[PDB]
UniProtKB/Swiss-Prot annotation:
Plays a role in the cellular breakdown of insulin, APP peptides, IAPP peptides, natriuretic peptides, glucagon, bradykinin, kallidin, and other peptides, and thereby plays a role in intercellular peptide signaling. Substrate binding induces important conformation changes, making it possible to bind and degrade larger substrates, such as insulin. Contributes to the regulation of peptide hormone signaling cascades and regulation of blood glucose homeostasis via its role in the degradation of insulin, glucagon and IAPP. (Microbial infection) The membrane-associated isoform acts as an entry receptor for varicella-zoster virus (VZV). A motif (SlyX motif) lies at residues 811-816. The SlyX motif may be involved in the non-conventional secretion of the protein. It comes from Homo sapiens (Human). The active site is at Q69 (proton acceptor). Homodimer. Can also form homotetramers. (Microbial infection) Interacts (via N-terminus) with varicella-zoster virus (VZV) envelope glycoprotein E (via N-terminus); the membrane-associated isoform may function as an entry receptor for this virus. Changing F488A: Strongly increased enzyme activity. Its EC number is 3.4.24.56. This is Insulin-degrading enzyme.
Length: 956
């Protein structure tokens, strides 16, 4: 029948709740393809995943395949304009990214449903005939440098590369994947390399159809999608590349029984234990590493972590199999350390080996396998519908590992019980096979070695044989038991029939002094799941830095106390989130609705009768202390956002104020605060999902009754429901606040042009403006001017007020970044004047689609309502209202707006700038306007005191 297609392949197994339709196939040139038809979708999407990545970089050009990934976006033969692809997505409500791992390069986009073909045609050109323009290459090489720079002082990245640096140095594993200006420009020039050629050469060599999978998701039929994919992808050449394989483990004998002592950037204490294992991927139908992961990483009674945490040695643990590449994997067990734990690392590892030994002694357990199989089956059956862009990206990666027919199920379904494989993996978790890393600031000064790409400081030792031998003779230890049946496993999936009184938006079904209950029975998704959100108000949670600290610790203590019991709930797809806010606390319980009341009842009950174990108190207080200190090591752009938040909010305690007040938090003082906090509250709740009104009222009243029974709670008075205001900046003012980041050698800037209170029309002026400037801000400040990797723009909403912000992290100083942004704003007014009426309407259409995009799953719909409730705007039909209004706007409206509120000589410009300086300070380019001298903020309190505050926004 069809020369262009090798194979069609059978029905693709899907959940029976999945109304989308699917066709797998294989093109003549080798491309594995999944087509997904969703006739209701708002965005379409596609992804392409090439089975090549940085493990295949040339040894003399670290980061080449990552760099290539950047360059594919910057023009092809059919679409030579550098930003054709970006701007097309932007004008049709889409977005795109890409990533490169050791074996893959993965490219995906979404777009408005009726412009799939447009988007896909541009996308296909990436794989056919990229330009790699010489001038683009010179520019983009900075963005890749900047990306690396952002990672340099991050502990996760450093450990990630330290591991690669300590295996076999001639194994591809040890390569440097990101690349930087040095590896991608400086040194190749020094060595006579034409990088445009090396990119042409690599693309030509590795971008072979036989190494590619594609997924496309759209409203079209399967037949129409098929024709489409054949049309744009049959022409990719098959150069028949063998798939790279790495049968030899980068950790050989010389790499085993080694100890590493590493100095962190942040003040953290961790121990990483690693064993090399073979590639388990081919055993996916039984998944022996998941079985052992489930056991070793367990957190219930009888578990490894239970005992380490009781000895006061660790607070958290992670264990299980870790991806390597084709040919090798790892098995890891990593824990954080208390100060005691740091001195007992040897005993910790013995306990690990005792627990593994217990697994050997009891042997593989079919009922445990049975449990995971069941959980996986229920999860698969009732999986949330995914956002298109993530779904295609994720399936494109897995098309390389699974038969077409299984790609949806493979990662979920379990079919084979394999005590042999389990035994075989257990036989590698042995002291003679072990690598041990200790990350601690106590190693400062004591190290003698330095990792080349990140500068990490470490020491490497043989673990002494006395130590191996002691671990090899690990007896059983009776504190360690396998877990018992998981009683939280759900079994009731009945979907309650939709009630006669069901509304499309949440309804206020209870409005008392104690509690305000918003409710909606799910009428869209029909999965046996529910979301229960509660905001608890207490003035005592933020009355001062000390109380804030206590609110925090109280909740951390509570979570830590519930963990053993909650963990079973989590494996059963039932979880919770519990945190202190500047208003009091937030509690959310999400998941299968079956056993939800039980978990929820337990939490409130513990909350109200809580008894603190003081060793837990002391460990958590110390972790929190480190945690506040560690803020100093966050990125300059985060610092900028943090300072602006502190400047524009009526009330806010700084981390310094918090750390200072922390020494005063005693056990006595915390026991006193808890009943104080719970004595008067107000509760506002959204209960949303597979539940009825009457079950909702029941749950609300149960939460209330428990607080009353156990903590005597009474109502707050309507007047004590303080929501905080934003600072109101003067017409034509400009304020700068400046700080130094002490760890990172970039600077950060945030610029905020405050506009006015939120409301239908102020909202849409800002949003439309943001839409129009979005891609060009990126295209100009990043792609042309190459000011940094991080370059953001868009609305700021806080405390009912709003405005336009830019964020940039750069090597260049902030005074300079200011001026490039102002230069950019002029370029924007000129281009709004110059654009066609129709280009104008496309932006409207594009924002329109963004706003009207239906939530694909329960919790996305909850989040939307929840934001209407926490903001106290309660505007559930906001998207229709605001989109109706948006369709009436014109170029004259936006030009006016820009001229009123935004332009440099705007009558109502209100500008504030946070400059975060790098670790050590004290052309083709458009003209930047002359700026006024700013008012430099010296003291955040004086500043606020000296300014009006805005009203709060009226409801409805
Ligand atoms: C089945 O395996 C598991 O149950 C858990 C282990 C665990 C410990 N405590 C609670 N659960 N999860 C994992 O092992 C998770 N896995 C990550 C993932 O699921 O994507 C990993 O092992 C990777 C850990 C890692 C290493 C380095 C940097 C980031 C993350
Ligand atoms: Zn990148």
């Amino acid at each position: 029948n069809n020369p262009a297609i090798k194979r069609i392949g059978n029905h693709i197994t899907k959940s029976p709740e999945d109304k989308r339709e699917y066709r797998g196939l294989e093109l003549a040139n080798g491309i594995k393809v999944l087509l997904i038809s969703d006739p209701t979708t708002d965005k379409s999407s596609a992804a392409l995943d090439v089975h090549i990545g940085s493990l295949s970089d040339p040894p003399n050009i670290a980061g080449l395949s990552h760099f290539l990934q950047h360059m594919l976006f910057l023009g092809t033969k059919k679409y030579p304009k550098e930003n054709e692809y970006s701007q097309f997505l932007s004008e049709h409500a889409g977005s795109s990214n890409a990533f490169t791992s050791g074996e893959h390069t993965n490219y995906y986009f979404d777009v408005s449903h009726e412009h799939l073909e447009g988007a896909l045609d541009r996308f296909a050109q990436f794989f056919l005939s990229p330009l790699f323009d010489e001038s683009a290459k010179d520019r983009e090489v900075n963005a890749v440098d900047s990306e690396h720079e952002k990672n340099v002082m991050n502990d996760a990245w450093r450990l990630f590369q330290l591991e690669k640096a300590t295996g076999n140095p001639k194994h591809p594993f040890s390569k440097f994947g990101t690349g930087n200006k040095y590896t991608l420009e400086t040194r190749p020039n020094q060595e006579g390399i034409d990088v445009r050629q090396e990119l042409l050469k690599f693309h030509s060599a590795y971008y072979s159809s036989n190494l590619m999978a594609v997924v496309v998701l759209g409203r079209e039929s399967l037949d129409d999608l098929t024709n489409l994919v054949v049309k744009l992808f049959s022409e990719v050449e098959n150069k028949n590349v063998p798939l790279p394989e790495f049968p030899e483990h980068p950790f050989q004998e010389e790499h085993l029984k080694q100890l590493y002592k590493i100095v962190p950037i942040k003040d953290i204490r961790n121990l990483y234990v690693t064993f090399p294992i073979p590639d388990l991927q081919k055993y996916y139908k039984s998944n022996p590493g998941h079985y052992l992961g489930h056991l070793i990483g367990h957190e219930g009674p009888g578990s490894l972590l239970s005992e380490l945490k009781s000895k006061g040695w660790v607070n958290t643990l992670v264990g299980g199999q870790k991806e390597g590449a084709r040919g090798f994997m790892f098995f890891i067990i990593n824990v954080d350390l208390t100060e005691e734990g740091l001195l007992h690392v040897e005993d910790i590892i013995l306990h690990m080996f005792q627990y593994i030994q217990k697994l050997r002694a009891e042997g593989p357990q079919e009922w445990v396998f049975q449990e995971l199989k069941d959980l996986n089956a229920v999860a698969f059956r009732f999986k949330d519908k995914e956002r298109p862009r993530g779904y295609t990206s994720k399936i494109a990666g897995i098309l390389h590992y699974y038969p077409l027919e299984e790609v949806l199920t493979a990662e979920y379904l379990l079919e084979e019980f394999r005590p042999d494989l389990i035994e075989m993996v257990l036989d590698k978790l042995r002291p003679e096979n072990v690598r041990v890393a200790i990350v601690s600031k106590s190693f400062e000064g004591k190290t003698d070695r330095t990792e080349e790409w990140y500068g990490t400081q470490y020491k490497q030792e043989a673990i002494p044989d006395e130590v191996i031998k002691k671990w090899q003779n690990a007896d059983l230890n009776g504190k360690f038991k396998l877990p018992t049946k998981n009683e939280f496993i759900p079994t009731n999936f009945e979907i309650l029939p939709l009630e006669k009184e069901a509304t499309p938006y949440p309804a206020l079904i209870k409005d008392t002094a104690m509690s305000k209950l918003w409710f909606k029975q799910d009428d869209k998704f029909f999965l046996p799941k529910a979301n229960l959100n509660f905001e608890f108000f207490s003035p005592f949670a933020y009355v001062d830095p000390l109380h804030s600290n206590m609110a925090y610790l109280y909740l951390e203590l509570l979570k830590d106390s519930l963990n053993e019991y909650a963990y079973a709930a989590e494996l059963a797809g039932l979880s919770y989130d519990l945190q202190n806010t500047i208003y009091g606390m937030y509690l959310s319980v999400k998941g299968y609705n079956d056993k939800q009341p039980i978990l929820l009842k337990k939490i409130i009950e513990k909350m109200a009768t809580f008894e603190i174990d003081e060793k837990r108190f002391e460990i958590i207080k110390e972790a929190y202390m480190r945690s506040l200190n560690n803020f100093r090591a966050e990125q300059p752009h985060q610092h900028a956002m943090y300072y602006l938040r502190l400047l524009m909010t009526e009330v806010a305690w700084t981390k310094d104020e918090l750390k200072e007040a922390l020494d005063d938090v005693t056990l006595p003082r915390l026991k006193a605060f808890i009943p104080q906090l719970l004595s008067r509250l107000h509760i506002e709740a959204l209960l949303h999902g597979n539940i009825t009104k009457q079950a909702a009222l029941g749950i609300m009243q149960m939460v209330e009754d428990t607080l009353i029974e156990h903590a005597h709670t009474k109502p707050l008075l309507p007047s004590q429901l303080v929501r905080y205001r934003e600072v109101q900046l003067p017409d034509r003012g400009w304020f700068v606040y400046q700080q130094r980041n002490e760890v990172h050698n970039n600077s950060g800037i945030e610029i905020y042009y405050q506009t006015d209170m939120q409301s239908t029309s102020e909202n849409m002026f800002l949003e439309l403006f943001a839409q129009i400037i979005s891609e060009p801000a990126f295209n100009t400040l990043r792609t042309k001017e190459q000011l940094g990797y991080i370059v953001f723009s868009g609305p700021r909403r806080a405390n009912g007020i709003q405005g336009l912000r830019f964020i940039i992290q750069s090597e260049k100083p902030p005074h300079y970044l200011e001026s490039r942004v102002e230069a950019f704003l002029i370029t924007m007014e000129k281009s709004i004047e110059d654009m066609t009426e129709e280009a104008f309407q496309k932006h409207i259409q594009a924002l329109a689609i963004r706003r009207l995009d239906k939530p694909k799953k329960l919790s996305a719909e909850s989040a939307k309502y929840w934001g209407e409730i926490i903001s106290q705007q309660y505007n559930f039909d906001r998207d229709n209202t605001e989109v109706a209004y948006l369709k009436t706007l014109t170029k004259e409206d936006i030009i006016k707006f820009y001229k009123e509120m935004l332009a440099v000589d705007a009558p109502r410009r209100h500008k504030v700038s946070v400059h975060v300086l790098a670790r050590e300070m004290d052309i083709n380019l458009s003209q930047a306007p002359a700026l006024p001298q700013p008012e430099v903020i010296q003291n955040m309190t004086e500043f606020k005191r000296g300014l009006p505050l805005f009203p709060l926004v009226k409801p409805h």
